[PDB]
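I have been asked to look over a protein record a colleague put together. The record follows directly below this note.
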Amino acid sequence: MNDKHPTPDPAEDNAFFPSAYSLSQFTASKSDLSGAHYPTPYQGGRWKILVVGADERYLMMDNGTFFSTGNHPVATLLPMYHLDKAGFSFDIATLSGNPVKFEWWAMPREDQEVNGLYSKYQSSFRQPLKLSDVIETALGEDSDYIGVFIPGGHGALMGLPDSQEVKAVLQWAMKQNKFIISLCHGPAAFLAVGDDPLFAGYKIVAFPDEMDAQTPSIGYMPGHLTWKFGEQLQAIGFELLNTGISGQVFQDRKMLTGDSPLAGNALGQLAAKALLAEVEQ
């Protein structure tokens, strides 16, 4: 619990889990999952939510090391928990169709409810749909998706930020006025729109670029990020509301964002209310 050295990841050459010290600062055995009780669920049985997960665990640092990352299970499973409880189902997809990669070192191992939720969706995480197939026949005007979920963790920084398929999903989302839900580094995916000013003026919270700049000092990552998603989002007309993290969330129209994995629970409450209130419109 003292060591600040990146912990070697045995499965991959020159790849590192977060240091023992960082892990003891940024992870816990149980989540702060709460308030996930909705007396008036959605029972319509139509509306699903599209989950776009990270297919890659190893993120290339500026110093040549791999950060052993993925989707952060708290940023992922907690919003999914509230929405599952609120009545909604999920399809899970990655860009390649390869298994969704979690930061299992951030999993709360003593959390029955979260462990429960993961297990309910484990077959889908372990063998997800391929996004290109989802995009073919599952979107359009007649889509059964009421929203898109793009979970966080640094794993979101790979593939998603310039996938032309994430682009099609975001354009669909906006065109059909659907919910877009994301947190932490998830919003890096909104960069897939390229030079489409689709998002101009939108207000979001996200993980601060500045925090990413400091966490390698406690060995959380084995190097620094090769680029800064916050400023680049800023460059496409996004207003970033937050310089720090408090696990807060914000909704601008149908854009729902959380500042960090800590925003996990809150995002779930915010999204649940928004979606429940709209299938009762």
